[PDB]
Structure 1
Amino acid sequence: MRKIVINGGLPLQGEITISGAKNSVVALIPAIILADDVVTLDCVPDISDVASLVEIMELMGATVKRYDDVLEIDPRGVQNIPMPINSLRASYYFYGSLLGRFGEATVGLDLGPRPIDLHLKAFEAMGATASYEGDNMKLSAKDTGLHGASIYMDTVSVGATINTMIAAVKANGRTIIENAAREPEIIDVATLLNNMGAHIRGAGTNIIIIDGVERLHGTRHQVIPDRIEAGTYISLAAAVGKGIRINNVLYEHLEGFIAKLEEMGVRMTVSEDSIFVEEQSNLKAINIKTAPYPGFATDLQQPLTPLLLRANGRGTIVDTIYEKRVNHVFELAKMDADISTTNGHILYTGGRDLRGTSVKATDLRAGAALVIAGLMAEGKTEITNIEFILRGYSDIIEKLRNLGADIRLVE
């Protein structure tokens, strides 16, 4: 019933403020199950993933108070019951918090490796074995209970690093996560937990040490800015802006992204709190290869692509994290972009005017790509399945209209 309508081809200008990180908050909320008292989060983004997580927490017995950018979560009433969600990668983080709190998790269920296998392997090493007792999966910790272990992650995994860390904070003994993911959201989750009384050291590095504690208390914690939202608006400002200030940005979390934009010839003025993106010219094509942080983020390759389509020359995008993250390509092609995918690889030639038409968001960051492309494109663009965008971009319509975009929510 809902679509986004954009009349593009018009320069944008002004300023936009970045909200708290989707990819921190979706771990922060379930981690709060571990606490003995209320935990309050500030700079909570108004995104659908947060609303869904709030609903689950309430159904599990938490009470949640919400206003402005704040969530007050009281997990004391949380019950040890099967989880009744699953469409969200973040649902996994309940495994770690429920294991940590109750010593067991009864949880909702392709033919090869699945990302979750990494989490379960870590849990198994901490004494929590799995089971398929009938339609559902059961994790249960053994003997004196959940315990520490030295865990080498066969491949780098943000989800498994975070889930292992959450599980470890109330485990018996020390957990050492080797080949840990370094994403700054992992630091944020560790920071929350430490201020709740955990003992986590090395977050942000390849080795994380956790010494299990008896109990966690409450705290009030500001979610780090969303570096992906920030990168999205920087890409947008470069593609169609004539001078836009992006506020609440931490450039230290965008080193790999900023490097590639500078390679293209993007001119921006970087401060400790904000970035001013100039009106751009003479951009040149680059090649993108995603990699674990601090490498170039897989979550940013799609939002960056329409800016690549502005540049002069040809390039390729290779996503080493999610090889088949290419579903924006078929949709961008409908807008007359010179873009294709074989594999695996995404090939583009920039410099062509895009033309608005009806396109469908296929996922969160592909949706963002179509929004930026819609703003660049001549004529009118209509985006359907906008629910994907609303998962991760807070106040997007309002933020963009404030930059002078002709964008509208229709139903």
Structure 2
Amino acid sequence: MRKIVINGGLPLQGEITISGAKNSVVALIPAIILADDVVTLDCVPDISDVASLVEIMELMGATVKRYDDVLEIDPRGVQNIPMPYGKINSLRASYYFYGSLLGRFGEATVGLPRPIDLHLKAFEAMGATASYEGDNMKLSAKDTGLHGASIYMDTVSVGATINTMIAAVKANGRTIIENAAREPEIIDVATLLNNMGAHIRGAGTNIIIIDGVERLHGTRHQVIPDRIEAGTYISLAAAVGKGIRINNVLYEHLEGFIAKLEEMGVRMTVSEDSIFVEEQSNLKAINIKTAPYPGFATDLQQPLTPLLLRANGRGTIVDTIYEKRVNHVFELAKMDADISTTNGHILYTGGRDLRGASVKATDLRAGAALVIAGLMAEGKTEITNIEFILRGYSDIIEKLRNLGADIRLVED
């Protein structure tokens, strides 16, 4: 079993590039099926989910050219065929094919082995009912096709919002989505569709209005950066770096995260789609309270924690999304960090230097914190159970080594 060995204390310096948003690309790819021509995607992350999606597109009749970070997909040869369960079960959001095939063919036969009910509830309003026979579900629209409807999301859902929006652009009439998700991935998908010739308004707000169109042409879209991976490296560069420029990062997708950094005293210049983090000193301890977008992302409270340990004073970290996301606390405490837990609150007192130890990555974002803390601590830090970290952050070991860090993979 492999592990990450880190000798910290060294100042980091150089350039680093953020990969494409995973949560966005999984919706962009199946949405291409609606197009009548080739659609090109730029800045596509090289992850297992993308590779899996490409195989499915190819199995349904789509030709795909893959090179650099670019995906050229021709959806013209896509056939209306059922999707086998043994090919879609390994997918994150395979339900994004639902709204895709509904707008394209008016039906979708899916294999079965509940947050998916909100998707169906929206499809129901658009005249699409789901039949169940054996181990298969077939979403079938009316003979006239999908039609617009006033949909109020009883629960804020990123998936249900996107899936509804995908099936709405090629429907008949006006579709209004109230209480919709405001996440950046919603805007990214809507941007792709609008550039294909759709009519989407209010993307990014609580009210999205879609005016259906008959045909959709091709276009070229650039996938938005992973805002979480961005905030991870920004927190890293501020903690141990002395001059790191984070490339391919949208400042407008980290409004809440940036505001908290400025409260600490984090100095940084912003130009183009990049952020240059200077060498930090005299940081102030702040309080963190996670919230739905554009609130403080719950997937950023852990990678920010080591930077808070660099700060001076005491603060409090509260996660309203996941009240039990504290599996990083004990591991950081093993590195001589003044961090503890009570109820749901995460107490911390930054200021004192950390010491290298043998820690285990419990989850993805927690392990990212251990890496940052590993670069801070004096001595050697060995992190076990890191297979999901290497998948969460593509080429992370090489990226940090190019920053001047003594990070290394050891297959034990």
Give your verdict on TM over 0.5.
yes
User: In structure 2, do the counterparts of structure 1 residues 331 and 260 end up closer, same or farther at CA, with 3 Å as the change threshold?
Assistant: same
User: In structure 2, do the counterparts of structure 1 residues 117 and 346 end up closer, same or farther at CA, with 3 Å as the change threshold?
Assistant: farther
Q: Does the 8 Å CA contact 2:113/2:135 hold for their aligned counterparts? A: no
Say whether 1:246 aligns with 2:249. no
Superposed displacement of residue 322, structure 1: 3.7
| Counterpart-to-counterpart distance in 2, 1:374 and 1:107 | 45
SS in 1 for 2:310: coil
Q: Which residue does the alignment assign to 2:217?
A: 217
User: In structure 2, do the counterparts of structure 1 residues 122 and 277 end up closer, same or farther at CA, with 3 Å as the change threshold?
Assistant: same
Superposed displacement of residue 240, structure 1: 0.8
User: In structure 2, do the counterparts of structure 1 residues 56 and 342 end up closer, same or farther at CA, with 3 Å as the change threshold?
Assistant: farther
| Counterpart-to-counterpart distance in 2, 1:75 and 1:326 | 44
User: In structure 2, do the counterparts of structure 1 residues 403 and 344 end up closer, same or farther at CA, with 3 Å as the change threshold?
Assistant: same
User: In structure 2, do the counterparts of structure 1 residues 335 and 47 end up closer, same or farther at CA, with 3 Å as the change threshold?
Assistant: farther
| Counterpart-to-counterpart distance in 2, 1:369 and 1:106 | 42
Stretch deviating more after TM superposition (377-386 or 179-188) = 377-386
Superposed displacement of residue 177, structure 1: 0.9
Q: Which residue does the alignment assign to 1:180?
A: 180
| Counterpart-to-counterpart distance in 1, 2:201 and 2:357 | 50
Q: Does the 8 Å CA contact 1:361/1:384 hold for their aligned counterparts? A: yes
| Counterpart-to-counterpart distance in 1, 2:117 and 2:344 | 23
SS in 2 for 1:71: strand
SS in 2 for 1:115: coil
Give a deviation string over 1:25-56, Cα, whole Å, max 9, x none.
Answer: 22211211222222111111223332232233
Superposed displacement of residue 362, structure 1: 4.0
SS in 2 for 1:362: coil
Give a deviation string over 1:34-87, Cα, whole Å, max 9, x none.
Answer: 222221111112233322322333333322221111111222333333333445
Superposed displacement of residue 330, structure 1: 4.5
Tell me how large the CA RMSD over aligned residues is. 2.8
| Counterpart-to-counterpart distance in 2, 1:262 and 1:400 | 24
The 5-angstrom pairing of residues 20-99 of structure 1 reads 20-84=20-84, 85-99=88-102
Say whether 1:394 aligns with 2:397. no
User: In structure 2, do the counterparts of structure 1 residues 66 and 137 end up closer, same or farther at CA, with 3 Å as the change threshold?
Assistant: same
User: In structure 2, do the counterparts of structure 1 residues 297 and 88 end up closer, same or farther at CA, with 3 Å as the change threshold?
Assistant: farther
SS in 1 for 2:132: coil
SS in 2 for 1:203: coil
User: In structure 2, do the counterparts of structure 1 residues 178 and 113 end up closer, same or farther at CA, with 3 Å as the change threshold?
Assistant: farther
Give a deviation string over 1:356-390, Cα, whole Å, max 9, x none.
Answer: 34444444333322322222233333334434234
Stretch deviating more after TM superposition (168-177 or 54-63) = 54-63
Q: Does the 8 Å CA contact 1:170/1:215 hold for their aligned counterparts? A: yes
| Counterpart-to-counterpart distance in 1, 2:97 and 2:18 | 27
User: In structure 2, do the counterparts of structure 1 residues 54 and 284 end up closer, same or farther at CA, with 3 Å as the change threshold?
Assistant: same
| Counterpart-to-counterpart distance in 2, 1:259 and 1:32 | 36
Stretch deviating more after TM superposition (198-207 or 319-328) = 319-328
Stretch deviating more after TM superposition (95-104 or 186-195) = 95-104
User: In structure 2, do the counterparts of structure 1 residues 251 and 11 end up closer, same or farther at CA, with 3 Å as the change threshold?
Assistant: same
Stretch deviating more after TM superposition (371-380 or 258-267) = 371-380
Stretch deviating more after TM superposition (243-252 or 334-343) = 334-343
| Counterpart-to-counterpart distance in 2, 1:172 and 1:361 | 49
Q: Does the 8 Å CA contact 2:202/2:209 hold for their aligned counterparts? A: yes
| Counterpart-to-counterpart distance in 2, 1:143 and 1:330 | 58
Which is higher, the Rg of structure 1 or of structure 2? 2
Give a deviation string over 1:77-128, Cα, whole Å, max 9, x none.
Answer: 33333333445542232222122223233445xxx99443332322222222
SS in 2 for 1:354: coil
User: In structure 2, do the counterparts of structure 1 residues 95 and 378 end up closer, same or farther at CA, with 3 Å as the change threshold?
Assistant: farther
Q: Does the 8 Å CA contact 1:39/1:218 hold for their aligned counterparts? A: yes
Superposed displacement of residue 353, structure 1: 3.3
Stretch deviating more after TM superposition (184-193 or 58-67) = 58-67
Structure 2: runs of 5+ lacking an equivalent: none
| Counterpart-to-counterpart distance in 2, 1:319 and 1:374 | 24
Q: Does the 8 Å CA contact 1:291/1:321 hold for their aligned counterparts? A: yes
Superposed displacement of residue 178, structure 1: 1.1
| Counterpart-to-counterpart distance in 1, 2:207 and 2:40 | 28
Q: Does the 8 Å CA contact 2:306/2:372 hold for their aligned counterparts? A: yes
| Counterpart-to-counterpart distance in 2, 1:341 and 1:224 | 35
Q: Does the 8 Å CA contact 1:182/1:294 hold for their aligned counterparts? A: yes
Superposed displacement of residue 236, structure 1: 0.2
Q: Does the 8 Å CA contact 1:9/1:375 hold for their aligned counterparts? A: yes
Q: Does the 8 Å CA contact 1:4/1:409 hold for their aligned counterparts? A: yes
The 5-angstrom pairing of residues 3-402 of structure 1 reads 3-84=3-84, 85-108=88-111, 114-342=114-342, 344-402=344-402
User: In structure 2, do the counterparts of structure 1 residues 122 and 325 end up closer, same or farther at CA, with 3 Å as the change threshold?
Assistant: farther
SS in 2 for 1:131: strand
Give a deviation string over 1:162-192, Cα, whole Å, max 9, x none.
Answer: 1111121122221111122222221111111
User: In structure 2, do the counterparts of structure 1 residues 399 and 219 end up closer, same or farther at CA, with 3 Å as the change threshold?
Assistant: same
| Counterpart-to-counterpart distance in 2, 1:281 and 1:354 | 17
Structure 1: runs of 5+ lacking an equivalent: none
Q: Does the 8 Å CA contact 1:47/1:393 hold for their aligned counterparts? A: no
User: In structure 2, do the counterparts of structure 1 residues 106 and 325 end up closer, same or farther at CA, with 3 Å as the change threshold?
Assistant: farther
SS in 2 for 1:232: helix
Give a deviation string over 1:135-159, Cα, whole Å, max 9, x none.
Answer: 4544332342322111112232222
User: In structure 2, do the counterparts of structure 1 residues 280 and 41 end up closer, same or farther at CA, with 3 Å as the change threshold?
Assistant: same
User: In structure 2, do the counterparts of structure 1 residues 280 and 139 end up closer, same or farther at CA, with 3 Å as the change threshold?
Assistant: same
Q: TM-score, normalised by structure 2?
A: 0.89
SS in 2 for 1:314: strand
Q: Does the 8 Å CA contact 1:240/1:376 hold for their aligned counterparts? A: yes
